[PDB]
Amino acid sequence: RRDWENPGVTQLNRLAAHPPFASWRNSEEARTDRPSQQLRSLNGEWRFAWFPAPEAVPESWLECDLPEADTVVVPSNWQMHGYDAPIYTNVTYPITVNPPFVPTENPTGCYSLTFNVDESWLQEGQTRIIFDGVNSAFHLWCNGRWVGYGQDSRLPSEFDLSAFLRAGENRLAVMVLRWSDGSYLEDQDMWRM
Amino acid sequence: DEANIETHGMVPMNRLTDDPRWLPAMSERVTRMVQRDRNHPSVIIWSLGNESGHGANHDALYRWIKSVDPSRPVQYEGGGADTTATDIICPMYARVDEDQPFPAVPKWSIKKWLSLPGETRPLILCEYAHAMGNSLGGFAKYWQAFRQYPRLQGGFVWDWVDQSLIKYDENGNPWSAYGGDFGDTPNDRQFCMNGLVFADRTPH
Amino acid sequence: RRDWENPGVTQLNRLAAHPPFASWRNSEEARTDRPSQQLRSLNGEWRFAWFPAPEAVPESWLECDLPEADTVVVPSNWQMHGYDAPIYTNVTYPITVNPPFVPTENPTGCYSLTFNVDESWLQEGQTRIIFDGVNSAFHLWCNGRWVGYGQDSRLPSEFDLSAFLRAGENRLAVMVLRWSDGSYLEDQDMWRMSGIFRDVSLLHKPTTQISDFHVATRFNDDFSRAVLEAEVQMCGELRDYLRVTVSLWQGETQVASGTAPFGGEIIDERGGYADRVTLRLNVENPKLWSAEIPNLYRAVVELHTADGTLIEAEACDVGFREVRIENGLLLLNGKPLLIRGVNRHEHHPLHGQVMDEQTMVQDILLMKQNNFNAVRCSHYPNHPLWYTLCDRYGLYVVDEANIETHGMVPMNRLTDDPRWLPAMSERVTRMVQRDRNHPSVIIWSLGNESGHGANHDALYRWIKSVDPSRPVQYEGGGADTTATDIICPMYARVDEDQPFPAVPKWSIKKWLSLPGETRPLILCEYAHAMGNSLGGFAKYWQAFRQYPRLQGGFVWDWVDQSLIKYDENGNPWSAYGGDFGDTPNDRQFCMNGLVFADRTPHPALTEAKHQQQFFQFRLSGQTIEVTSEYLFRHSDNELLHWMVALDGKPLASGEVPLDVAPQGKQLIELPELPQPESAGQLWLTVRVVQPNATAWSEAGHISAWQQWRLAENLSVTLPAASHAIPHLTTSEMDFCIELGNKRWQFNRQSGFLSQMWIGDKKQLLTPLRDQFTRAPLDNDIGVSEATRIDPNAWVERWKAAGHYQAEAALLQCTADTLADAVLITTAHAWQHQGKTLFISRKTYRIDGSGQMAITVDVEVASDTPHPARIGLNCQLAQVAERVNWLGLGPQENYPDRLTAACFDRWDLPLSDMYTPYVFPSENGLRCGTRELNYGPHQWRGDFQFNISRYSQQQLMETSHRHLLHAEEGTWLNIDGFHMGIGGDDSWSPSVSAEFQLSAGRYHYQLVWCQK
Ligand SMILES: *[C@@H]1C[C@@H](O)[C@@H](O)[C@@H](CO)O1
Ligand SMILES: *[C@@H]1C[C@@H](O)[C@@H](O)[C@@H](CO)O1
Ligand SMILES: [Mg+2]
Ligand SMILES: [Mg+2]
Ligand SMILES: [Mg+2]
Ligand SMILES: [Mg+2]
Ligand SMILES: [Mg+2]
Ligand SMILES: [Mg+2]
Ligand SMILES: [Mg+2]
Ligand SMILES: [Mg+2]
C-alpha cells in the first residue's frame, strides 16, 4: 500500500492522543511525581540495520534478528551513528518536489528489540507501546505480526500491544522510513535526519 | 507550543496548506499537539506551525483551537504575519523603523505596523535579531521600541544554539561542521548556525 | 485492510473534486450545453450478485462474470430489486453503535459491467470513471486489477482508469458495502438502502486540461455594474503558448471576453500559482438572478494555444446575484428575503433513492405552483442535475453536507472528536468544490442533527474562508451556536417557548431578541406535515411578515417517503416502516410530506400555497388594496379577478389588470354594489390569475386569493303556516312522530333517534348519537406506542380518561305536543369509572313543514382532557354520488387549517370527501358549513362535517389505507365544534390553546329536513 506516499493515511491502528500518563497504582506516588512501576522504559540497546529502500528489507527480519545487524543505542538518529549522511538544506526540499511521492531510494532503518513482559501485565489490563518520536514514518510489528503505522516525527505514536504479547520474551520490529508524505510538512531549516 | 507543519519549499508557499486534501494530515499535527500539551501552565500560546504560507487549512485549524481551548491565544506568521489565522501580529525580521514593502507579504516597521488602519492586535516578533556569526547589531533599538510602545510586546530571537555537528579529523580531533560537510548536496552551508551560543553551549 | 472500518481512510486513489465537467472540444457546444462526445453514460444494464458479507465474495468474480449473477438496471438501490429489505429507522442507528466497526454480516452488492472503449480515448488523454453516487462504500477493479476505494454516498467519486483500460472490451467490478464507517455519518431519518444509485459515466480529458474553475460576481452599490471574476487552474505541462479565454454570453450575444496566459499574482514569499490564472470581465447593467426572475448568462472557459487551437472547453450557467447578511437581515441583491421553503429528500416510491429528471421537474413545478421559492437539500448534496434545474427554473437552495450522527449519545460524540475531523471535512469540502458555481445555492449547511462539536466550528471557518459569497448555517447544538450565521431552529413555535435544557427551542419571536442576539432567523424545519397536519401554519406566516428578522423557513417536508408493495392480486399499496420485515423501525414517521409519494397533493399543500402568496390584500369600502411582496419583478403576468356572491349565488364580478411594482401597492375601486334581493351574507372573493403560461405554470394559473364578508341582510321573514301538523304516537318503548309520508322514531330507553323513514324506506343503519372522539391523527398519537405509551400525547389522555369507552346513560326522554309541532327532550350523561365526563341535553322540534330542528347543549367536566370534538354521528342507509354544501372548501379543512378554504357552494363526488392518508385517521372535515346536501337529505346550521364510507371506529382500527373497506351506507359526522389538528411538531401536543375545546359548556343547533 505504500502508506508513506499518501497524505490520506497518516496512521493505522494508532491510539488517541492524551496528556502524559503513568497509571500509578499508588496515589501518593502520583502526588509526588515519583517513578511508576506501570510506565517502563524501553530505551537502551537495540538491534539495527540500514537498507537503501523498504523493498530491500528481508522478510526474515520480521521473525528473526538479522545477523548482520549491529547493536546501537536508542533513542538515536541513524546519521549520528554514521549509517548515512545528515543533510542541511534550508528552504529547498531535500527530495524532489512531487507530492505526495518520495524517492524510490528511501533510507530505511530496521530496528528491533527483544524484551521481557511479566505475566502480571498480561493477565489483566492493557499494555501499550509509546514511541515519543520516530522520524519520519514507520511500520511496527510485534512477535512477527503487524500492529500499525505512524507519521508526524514530533508527537508520540501509541499502539495497544495487549493481544500481541506473551509472557517472557517478545520481539518488536520497527521499519523506519527516512522520507514520507509527512516530509512534505517537515521542511524546517535544520539538519534532515 | 507549535505544530510540526512547515512546507517552506513549496511554490507558492501555501500550495499544500490551501489544499483541502492536505487538511487531514495538517489537522492531526495541530489537534494531537493540543491534546497532549494543554494541561501545561508554561504553554501560553499555540502556534499553527511555521513558513507554510497562509491557506484555508490554517483558518480551519485556528478555529478548531479557539474552540477547544479558549484559554490561550493562537498565533501564526505565514502569509504576511497579520492574517485572519493569528491573534498576534508575529512577523519575522520586521525592522524597528525601516519598512520592507515586499509585495503581498510586506514586512512593515514594527512601530508602523501596529497603527495601520483598522489594526488593533499586539505585536510580538516570532523571529528577530538573526544571531548568525558576528551579529546582534541594532539589538538595543528593538528593546528601546518594545519599552516605549505598549503593544510592542517583544519577540523571540532567532535563535538559541548553533546547529553545528561534530566531525573528527584524520588525527581524531573533533571539529565543528556545517552544511555540505557530510557530502550533503545541495546544502545551505553555514546558514544552520544562527545561535547566541555555540553547539556546546559556550556563549557567543 | 478492512478500509470500511476506519474513518481515517475515506478513499484510495480518488481524484480531486471539481465542478461539473464535460470536456467539450468545440466551444459552441459548450456554450449551448449540448451533449459532449467526451462524456459517456455507463447507465443501463449491469450484472449484479448479492452476498451476505464481503468475505463471501468469490475471487473468481474479479476476473469474470458470476453465472449466478443477474442482469439489472443501474442506477438502482438493490433493495428495490428485492435483494434485501430496506430499513426505516429515524434516530436509532440501523447497526450496533460501536464506531468505527460495522456488523460482520454486511450485505455486499457485486456489480460488474462489460463494455467497450475506443482506442481514440486511450491513445491520448485521460479516461476517468465517475460514480455520482455509491451507498455506502466501495472497492473498484478494472480488468481484474484493483483501482481504488471511496466513501460518502452523496458525492461523486472519480478514478483515473487510463492505465487500466484497453481498446475494445473491458470489465469493471464494483463491490459495494452496505455498511461502513461512513454510515456513522449517514444517520438521516429516511429509508436505509444501498447500491450504485446515481449515474456512472466515463469522462475523457486531454492531458493538458482545465482541472478546476471558480466563478464570482461582485457588484457596485446599486447593482448597476458587476465584475465577473473567473479563477482557472490547469493540470499538465505548462507552456508559454498556453492560454485561457473566458467569455460571457447572454443568449446569443457575447457580452464580454478576456484572454490570458497562465501565471497568477504573487501570493507569498515563494511567489504565486504558475498553473492558474484569473480573468476579470466588466459587465454593465447585468440582468440579475433571483427566484423571481432567474436571469442567466453562460460562462465558457476555453483552454487553447496562442495560435488559436482549442484544447478543451468547460462551462457553466452564471446567475449575477449577491447574498449577504447585513444588520441582521439576509439580503439577496440588497433586498431582504422571505423564504417560502420546503425540505425535499430524493425519494421515488418505485425507484427508492434513484432520481430522474422527470421527477425533479415535476417537483419543481408543483413547488413553484404552490408558492415555494426555496428548497433545503435535506440532508446531503443532491444529484447534480437538481442544481441545474434550480438555477434555471429559479429556486433558492440550501446545499447541505452529508453528515448526520443523530443516533450518537450525546449527539456530538463524533463531531466533537478530532479523529472524525478528516472524514467530516471531506463531506463539506468536496460539496463546496462541486457546487460553488451554482447561483441557486445561496447558503451552505454543515449537515444535520449532529450536535455541535469543534469539528463544525473548524468547517464553518473553512467555508467562510474559501467562499465568502454565501452564508453558512447549521442547526445542531441549539440552533444559534458559533457555527451558524443564521438562527435556524427546527420546530421552534411562534409564541410558545419549549425550554429544554441545553438546547431550548424558544418562541421565534423571543429568540430574535435574546440579549446580545442579532442574527436573522429562518427555521431549517417547521410545520411538520405528517398526515392530517399543518394546523397553525398561518400563525408562522403572520409572524414572518410582521418581524423583519423572521425571514421564513423550510417546511418538513415535501414528499411522503412511502414505498410501493404489491398484494396477493398484484395490486400496489403504500408501505412504511416495518412493512419489509425491517426492525427495529419507526413505522409511519417517514411519511411527513405535503404530497403523497406519487406527487398527488395532500390537502395541506393548499394551505401552504395560500399563506405563501406573494400578494397581500386589504379592503376598505369599495376599495381593495393589493400589495406586492415580490422584491424584483413587477406584476407583469397578473390580473385581479373579483366576484361577489350571496350565499353562493353570484351577483357580480369583473377583472382588472394588476400593475404593481415590487413592494408597491395598487388601489382598485369596485363598482357600486347593487343591492341584493334576498336575505343572506354577501361574500367578496378575489383571485390573482396569470394570463400567460410561463416556464413553471399554465395560462390561467391562480397564484393568490382572499375573501371578505360584505353586507349581510338577516332574515326576519316569518316562515308560513304549515299545511299540516305532525302527530305523536306514544308507546312503552318509543315516541314516534308522523308527518305526511315521513316518520321519526325515538327509542325511550336509549333516548336517541333510532330510525327515520321516507315512505317505507329506512334512512338510518345506526342511531343518531353524540360523538366526543375522533380516530386519532398522527399528531394526536405522537410517539405513543402500545408497547411504550406516551402518557402526555392527546390520544393517551383521551384513552385514559375513558373518552373512547364512555357510555351514554339516559337521564331523561320526554315528548310534548305543541300547537304545530312535536317536541322531544332528552338528556344523557357519559361516564367512565363513575365520573361524568359529558352531559348532552337536546330538543328535537318536528313541525308541519317536516323540518326537524335539533338543539344541543353540552357540558364537559373541567377536569377531563378537552375532547376531540362535540358533535353527532350516524350511519345513513343510503349511498349517494355527490356531496353539495355551502361552507368552506372545496378541500378538507380544520379549525387551525382553514385559511386557504373559501366560503361558497361546492359540489364533489363522495370519494373526494375522504382524504386517503396512508396512515388512516379522522379526515375530510369541512368547517364553516351552513348547509349540507346528500341524497334527499339537507342539514342546515353552522357546523363542521365529514361524510364517507368509513366509520371513525374503522379508521382508528386500521393502520394502512389499503386495508380499509367501505361500510354499508354512509357515515356522517356533524360537529358543532372540532378540535384543531396542530402539527408544530408531531411528537408532543401541538394544538394551540385557542383551538382546544375548553369552554366547558357548548351549544349548537341544526335543522335536518328532506330535499
Ligand atoms: C525564521 C525561520 C527559522 O526556521 C530560520 O529559517 C530563520 C532564518 O535562519 O528564519
Ligand atoms: C428534522 C430532521 C428530519 O430529517 C426529520 O427527522 C424531521 C422529523 O420528521 O425533523
Ligand atoms: Mg501517509
Ligand atoms: Mg513499588
Ligand atoms: Mg517465550
Ligand atoms: Mg523555513
Ligand atoms: Mg549551495
Ligand atoms: Mg473507512
Ligand atoms: Mg435525524
Ligand atoms: Mg382569509
Ligand code: NA
Ligand atoms: Na511594549
Ligand code: NA
Ligand atoms: Na537558519
Ligand code: NA
Ligand atoms: Na420577516
Ligand code: NA
Ligand atoms: Na420523519
Ligand code: NA
Ligand atoms: Na399585470
Ligand code: NA
Ligand atoms: Na388509524
